[PDB]
Every structure is written in structure tokens, then in C-alpha cells.
């Protein structure tokens, strides 16, 4: 089961076409599954073209020899998910899954709301300082977020995490955490989060003075 | 009857589906592989009928209208005979 495309980005109302190639078809049975953010896998299609219960009719499957394809017409934001083809074949049975296809649903560009959080008093007493910068509800996913401490950009001591695309509104959120020792944190004054994103009219900087 | 369920689970009756469909389109080894599979049920008439029932069950999606259903059901009923196997006396294909 060789699955393609690995990545897909399409707008609502368009048609998504995913394909798998079975290596062999000895007593083969083909299915397709959907993995939404946070949710258990959901059977879409079984036996190549039969639609599972609770699945809208715009999902359909077909086969042409060794090639099996899932067609998702009239795309919705809720189709944002990872899709897997599934072959059971041979005796003793063997189950193979495709490598998966990540389907993004496009939307109108949305600038991030930028928020910054200094370290808690509790954590500082523990001997460390975590500063957090949040980008909320933006699209597209590309955004450059850096910490800038007394005008020096921080590279290698921060960690970034991005949510999966929201099923309802098709946005991402992102956190950037700078972790420092107590001693290092107190050595500097100005902590600023520098953000560029296509939805912004210019780069954004949210900052706080340490001790204020 | 638990013996029957186990061998039907391991049986591969896809060749029977393909042979039957080839046969109606007329009106290579699919038939022989099908008869090989059905030969495993010759010693239990009840299990043989269950195998034919499962072929009919799995073919409902591919059949449109009673004419197509009847045309496929006739060939399925004759399939053990065409395989040189003893057929079940009573066998409802629904």
C-alpha cells in the first residue's frame, strides 16, 4: 500500500483525490480511515467502494486494478484530518496501512492574536523562568516567532508547538516557550516576542519589562 | 456449526464472485479456484449453502434491480453443480 499524495491543501467545495497502490491483491479487501484532531479513527469506506454508516455521500471510493482511490467531493473544514488506506490480504491474514495523507482545508487569511506571559512567581521560586508567547487562531500555518532578549534573538533555547488545524474554523494556534535559569532570567530586562505572519499588516512585537 | 464459521472465515470466495460475473457478461482460473474453495464445504450441505449465501450477501451492492439479482442468483444456485460438487437441496439465497 503506497499512498499518495502525502500532503494536500484544498479549499472548501473542491474535490480531494487520494490514491493507494496495493502490491498484491490475493483475497484483498481495501478500506479508508479518517483521523480527525483528537478523535478515534473513523471508517469511511470498506471493500474499496462501500460507504460506512454515518459517512456523508460526498465520500466515495473506487478501484482500477491495483490502484484504489478515495474521492472527497464538496470539501468541508471538518475534513481537515489524516487519511489512511487499509489492505487486509492473504492467508494467514496480513494488514497493511498506507503511509497516510494529511489534508489541510484552506481558509481566508487570518492574522494571529499575539499574547505574552511572563514566568509565574511560583516557578521563579523553583529556580527557573519560562516565558510563553501565544499566537491564536491564524491561517496559513507559516509564521516566524522568535524571542528577543535585550535585542538579542534567541535561537536554540526555545521550544515551539503548533496545534492541529481546527475542524470548525480551519485555524492554527502556536506557543513559543523560552526556558531559562533563575540566574540567566534576572540577567536581562526586556523580553519581547517577535512575530511575522502574512495576515499581519506589519511584524508584531509584544514585550514586557522584567519586574513590571 | 462453529467449525463451519471458522472455515468460512478463512475461505476466499472472491474467485467465485469474479467467475460468476464473467459468466453473465458472456451471456481464466477463477472458476477452478472457486470450485477448489467450495470443495471444502462439500461434506456439509448446510455450510455449503451458507457459503453461497455469503457470496450473495457480498454482491448486493454490485447488483441493481431484480433482473440483475435474479440473473446472478440463478448462476449462484447452479455453481456447485457446475463445480462437480453436491449442492444443497434446500437453500434460500436472501
Amino acid at each position, epitope marked *: 500500500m503506497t499512498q499518495s499524495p502525502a500532503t494536500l491543501s484544498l479549499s472548501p467545495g473542491e474535490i480531494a483525490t487520494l490514491s493507494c497502490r496495493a502490491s*498484491q491483491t490475493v483475497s484483498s479487501y481495501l478500506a479508508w480511515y479518517q483521523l480527525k484532531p483528537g478523535q478515534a479513527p473513523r471508517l469511511l469506506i470498506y471493500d474499496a467502494s462501500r460507504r460506512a454508516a454515518g459517512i456523508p455521500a460526498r465520500f466515495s471510493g473506487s478501484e482500477s486494478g491495483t490502484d484504489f482511490t478515495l474521492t472527497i467531493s464538496s470539501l468541508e473544514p471538518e475534513d481537515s484530518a489524516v487519511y489512511y488506506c487499509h489492505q487486509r490480504s*492473504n*492467508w494467514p491474514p496480513v494488514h497493511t496501512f498506507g503511509q497516510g495523507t494529511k489534508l489541510e482545508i484552506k481558509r481566508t487569511v487570518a492574522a494571529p492574536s499575539v499574547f505574552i506571559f511572563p514566568p509565574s512567581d511560583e516557578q521563579l521560586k523553583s529556580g527557573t523562568a519560562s516565558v510563553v508567547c501565544l499566537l491564536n487562531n491564524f491561517y496559513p500555518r507559516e509564521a516566524k516567532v522568535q524571542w528577543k532578549v535585550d535585542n538579542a534573538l534567541q535561537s536554540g533555547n526555545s521550544q515551539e508547538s503548533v496545534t492541529e488545524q481546527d475542524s470548525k474554523d480551519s485555524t492554527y494556534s502556536l506557543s513559543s516557550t523560552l526556558t531559562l535559569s533563575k540566574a540567566d532570567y534576572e540577567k536581562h530586562k526586556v523580553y519581547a516576542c517577535e512575530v511575522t505572519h502574512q495576515g499581519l499588516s506589519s511584524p508584531v512585537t509584544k514585550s514586557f519589562n522584567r519586574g513590571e | 456449526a462453529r467449525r463451519c464459521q471458522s472455515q468460512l472465515e478463512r475461505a476466499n470466495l472472491r474467485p467465485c464472485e469474479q467467475h460468476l460475473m464473467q459468466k453473465i457478461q458472456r451471456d481464466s482460473q477463477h472458476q477452478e*479456484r472457486c470450485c*477448489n474453495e467450495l*470443495n471444502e464445504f462439500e461434506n456439509n450441505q448446510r455450510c455449503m449453502c451458507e457459503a453461497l449465501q455469503q457470496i450473495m450477501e457480498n454482491q448486493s451492492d454490485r447488483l441493481q434491480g431484480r433482473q440483475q439479482e435474479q440473473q446472478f442468483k440463478r448462476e449462484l444456485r447452479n455453481l456447485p453443480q457446475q*463445480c462437480g460438487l453436491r449442492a444443497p437441496q434446500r437453500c434460500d439465497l436472501d
Partner: antibody
Amino acid sequence: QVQLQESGPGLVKPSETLSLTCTVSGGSMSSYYWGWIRQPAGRGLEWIGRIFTTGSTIYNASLNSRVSMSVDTSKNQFSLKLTSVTAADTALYFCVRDRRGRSHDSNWYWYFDLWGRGTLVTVSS
Amino acid sequence: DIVMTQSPSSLSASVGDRVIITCRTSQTLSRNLNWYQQKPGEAPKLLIYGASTLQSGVPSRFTGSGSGTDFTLIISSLQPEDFATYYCQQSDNTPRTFGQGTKVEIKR
């Protein structure tokens, strides 16, 4: 152009287990019957057993206690296991197709149409 | 088990001779009487199935007949390559059973 070939050790100590594998080439083994046949010093041919690709088997009753066969269609292989072997088990071991074919007279016939070249197995210490 | 007995157990014949092999069975066969030819260092080769039906590729030299418990293989005109052991075999039930073999040696 379906072909068969045996593989496995040519020497087994007595009381140990003989194991052999037949590899099918030129086409999928799926939904055909397979078997093993043995030819000892006496020159006769002894049928060992038949295995279908569901894994169901029928063995020769003399060896049934000590014989077993298994199939793996994704490797296009089936195998033979014989335990507690003695000198009596020294033989040339053939893998075969147990064909149930329809002839031009529209009737179905059973016969062994495909054979491997055979592999000698010697039982001694 | 169905016991298969062949006669002669061995014979010597010349190139061009007719060779006749009889196979008797301990029980009545319905259909699947098979004949094989095993040359030295080779696996047996199917000649005839269903008592009388020639396998594809097999030369017209070889004919089979009979029914019930009484079957015969005829090589109408022996050739040097027919040096071999010939077996009858039933596949009407399990266990499949072979005859003891008929060694055909060639006088020259």
C-alpha cells in the same frame, strides 16, 4: 510456468524434527491444494498429506501423529514438519500441486500435475 | 486405503515394442486413475488422468483404458527415452495411493 522447489536441511538427527519448505513461483498459490510426497529407498511413492490455502489439512494416518503442514500465501510457500524421525524417514521429499481441474469433457478430475525436483533428507547421527 | 497393484513389477523390452502395464485396485474407482512416468533423477511426470485422458504435451505413444478395478497403460512403440518407472495412482479419496511401480528396462 508455475514451478515448485523444495528447500530445507539434507541431514536430520534421529528423534529431531525434519522441516522443509516448498516455494511456488510463476503464479500465486492462492486457492489451490498442495501436498508432499515421499520416495524412500524402496522406490515406492508415499503420499504424506494435502493442505489447502485456508490452512486445512488431510494427513496420511501412519504419520498423522508426527506430521504437520502450514501455508503462507504472502510468501507463496507451504511447509512440512515431521517430528521424532527415524531412519525410516530417510527419503526423497517432493512437493506437489494436488490439482482439481476441469477437463475438455466438462468433468472435474484430481491429479498431481506439478512436482518439485525433490530434495533428499538423510536421517542419521 | 485403496491398494494399487501393478503388473509386471519389471520388464525388459526393445525400441519399437508394445509395452502393456496392468493396474488392479482393491476397491472400485469412480474416476481418478492417474498414470505417472519417473525417469532417473527426475520427479514423476503425469501422463494420463481419468484413466484415459492424455495430459497436454504427453506423446500419443501413451494410452490408458479401463474402469472399475482394472486399468491398463499401453506404450504402443517404446522409445529409448521411455526408460523409466511407471506408476498408477488413485485420487478418488484420501489417502492418495500409488502402485509399487513398473520398471521398464530397454533391450538393445
